[PDB]
């Protein structure tokens, strides 16, 4: 915990000296075309331009605050560029809160520039202390750090391959296994073979080079089909954050500084909540926290989504919640309305409007209905 606090101070120090004293990074985008216009303007820019003080404007809008507009721009932008709709990313199989690179991304012929674009955007979020609106697997952060994938990381990406590779390491393959430093996989209804190293097609796997074989084959099975895309993204990222600034971070730390805090603590939440037209000991407020206490992590993510636009919070947690103009704590507003209404959200204000429901069960059920997934 402390060690991360020191690692972040050191990163901030070094990012600070990388920033030029003079000049600005100027972006002016329409809100309806944030993605494509941000892409054209950022890709015109040199790496060095991306370190300058951010100066962002929405077309036709005067912002309250340049830092605020910047915060909003990255959140809105990253929500577009990561949306599987544009073909670059997809939802991971078992989890909709985790994105993966889409292997089929090349239907966009220009797709590598977009991955390069995404890298630069993620790097700019780190460099300037904002957050990305999304999330990736831990092996993705690990590859983004330049670390290699353990075998342990296979226990989710491929249990059947994980077990076979484990068995190869545990037992003597002499005479039993005629494997080669080349691997085959199913690509577009077809079988395509891939050397894990130069001339691997001609290199037997044996008891002496087993460990090297399994290391190369894990690393390959993560990058399988997405290699050029990851390279382009990682180039964009390291154009903003040089890879040596993150030597001392592990994958879980990179995820916090890029996406913020995913684990939602109810006590930190309760304590940094404002109340409008209700009191700490009023029923609507007791029931709300009772329901949040029962909500599992997915449900709490959706409730936070509903009221703020983000299922994540800053590193500092709920006291650091931002709204429109600067900070705005989470706010529960008890409203004078018909008790069959659902809670309504005002995400510019991190405010939820709640009617004076008659029982805990009514609030519980009506809250769950409000935060239904889109």
Partner 1 sequence: MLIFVWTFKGNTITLEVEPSDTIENVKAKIQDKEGIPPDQQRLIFARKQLEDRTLSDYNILKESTLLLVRRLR
Span from 181-189, 249-257, 276-284, 295-303 in contact with Cl ion (CB under 5 A): 276-284
CB 12 within 8 A of CB 42: no
Read out DSSP for 209-225? Answer: THHHHHHHHHHHHHHTT
Binding string to Cl ion for residues 285 to 314, with x set by CB under 5 A, is what?
Answer: -----------------------------x
Between vectors from CA 238 to CA 233 and to CA 239, what angle results, nearest 5°?
95
3 state SS of 274: strand
Shortest distance, CB of residue 84 to partner 1, whole angstroms? 24
Q: Which does 59 bind (CB under 5 to 8 A by kind): Cl ion, partner 1, Na ion, none?
A: Na ion
By the rule CB under 5 A, 328 interacts with Cl ion: no
Which of Na ion, Cl ion, partner 1, none does 63 bind, CB closer than 5 to 8 A by kind?
Answer: Cl ion
Site residues for Na ion per CB under 5 A = 15-16, 19, 59
Q: Supply the minimum distance, in Å, between the C-beta of residue 57 and Cl ion.
A: 8
For residues 62 and 178, which CB has a smaller minimum distance to partner 1 in the complex?
A: 178
Q: Which of 144, 171, 167, 145 lies closest to 154, judged by CA?
A: 167
Choosing among partner 1, Na ion, Cl ion, none, which partner's interface includes residue 151 (Cβ < 5 to 8 Å by kind)? none
d(Cα 218, Cα 158) in Å, to the nearest integer? 10
What whole-number distance in Å separates Cα of residue 316 and Cα of residue 260?
Answer: 9
- Which runs of E-coded beta strand occur in the chain? 24-29, 53-58, 89-91, 99-101, 182-186, 191-195, 273-276, 330-334, 344-346, 351-354
SS3 category, 77: helix
Q: Return the one option of Cl ion, Na ion, partner 1, none that residue 176 interacts with (CB less than 5 to 8 A, by type).
A: partner 1
Residue 161 touches which of partner 1, Cl ion, Na ion, none (CB < 5 to 8 A by kind)? Answer: partner 1
> Is 338 a residue of the active site?
no
Q: How far is the CB of 178 from partner 1 (least distance, A)?
A: 5
| Residue 38: count of CB within 10 angstroms of its CB | 24
List the one residue out of 76, 105, 80, 102 whose CA is nearest residue 89: 102
Number of C-beta neighbours around residue 207 at 10 A = 11
Q: Which residues contact partner 1 (rule: CB under 8 A)?
A: 160-161, 163-164, 166-167, 170, 173, 175-180, 182-184, 191
Spot the catalytic one: 259, 278, 338, 348. Answer: 348
Q: Determine the 3-state secondary structure of 359 from DSSP.
A: coil
Q: Which of 128, 130, 302, 366 binds Cl ion (CB under 5 A)?
A: 128
CB nearer to Cl ion: pick between 26 and 344: 26
| Segment interacting with Cl ion (CB under 5 A) among 50-58, 118-126, 177-185, 246-254 | 50-58
Q: What is the C-alpha to C-alpha distance for residues 183 and 196, in angstroms, rounded to an integer?
A: 7
Give the alpha-carbon dihedral of 12, 17, 21, 24, to 10 degrees: -60
Q: Which residues are catalytic?
A: 348
Which parts of this chain interact with Cl ion (CB under 5 A)?
26, 28, 53-54, 63, 128, 282-283, 314, 320, 337-338
């Amino acid at each position: 915990k402390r060690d991360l606090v020191q690692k972040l101070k050191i990163l901030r120090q070094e990012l600070s000296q990388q920033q030029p004293q003079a000049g600005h990074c100027r972006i002016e985008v329409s809100r309806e075309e944030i993605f494509e216009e941000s892409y054209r303007q950022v890709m015109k820019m040199r790496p060095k331009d991306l370190w300058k003080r951010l100066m962002i404007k929405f077309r036709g809008e005067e912002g309250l605050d340049y830092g605020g507009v910047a915060r909003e721009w990255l959140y809105l932008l990253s929500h577009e560029m990561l949306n599987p709709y544009y073909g670059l990313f997809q939802y991971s199989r078992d989890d909709i809160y985790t994105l993966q690179i889409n292997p089929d991304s090349a239907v966009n012929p220009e797709h590598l520039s977009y991955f390069h674009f995404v890298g630069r955007i993620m790097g700019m979020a780190v460099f300037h202390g904002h957050y990305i609106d999304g999330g990736f697997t831990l092996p993705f952060y690990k590859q983004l750090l330049g670390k290699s994938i353990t075998l342990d990381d296979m226990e989710l990406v491929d249990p059947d391959l994980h077990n076979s590779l484990v068995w190869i390491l545990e037992n003597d393959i002499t005479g039993v296994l005629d494997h080669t430093f080349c691997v085959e996989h199913n690509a577009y209804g077809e079988i395509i073979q891939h050397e894990l190293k130069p001339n691997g097609k001609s290199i037997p796997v044996n008891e002496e080079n087993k460990k090297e074989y399994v290391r190369l084959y894990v690393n390959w099975r993560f990058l399988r089909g997405i290699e050029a895309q990851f390279l382009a993204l990682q180039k964009g990222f390291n154009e903003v954050i040089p890879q040596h600034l993150l030597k001392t971070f592990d994958e879980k730390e990179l995820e916090l500084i890029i996406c913020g805090l995913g684990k939602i603590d109810v006590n930190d939440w309760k304590v940094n909540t404002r109340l409008k037209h209700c009191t700490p000991d009023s029923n609507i407020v007791k029931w709300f926290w009772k329901a949040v206490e029962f909500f599992d992590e997915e449900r709490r993510a959706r409730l936070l989504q509903f009221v703020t636009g983000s299922s994540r919070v800053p590193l500092q947690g709920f006291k650091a919640l931002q709204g429109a103009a600067g900070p705005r704590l989470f706010t529960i507003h008890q409203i004078d309305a018909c008790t069959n209404n659902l809670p309504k959200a005002h995400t510019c204000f991190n405010r939820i409007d709640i009617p004076p429901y008659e029982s805990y069960e009514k609030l519980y059920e009506k809250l769950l209905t409000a935060i239904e997934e889109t």
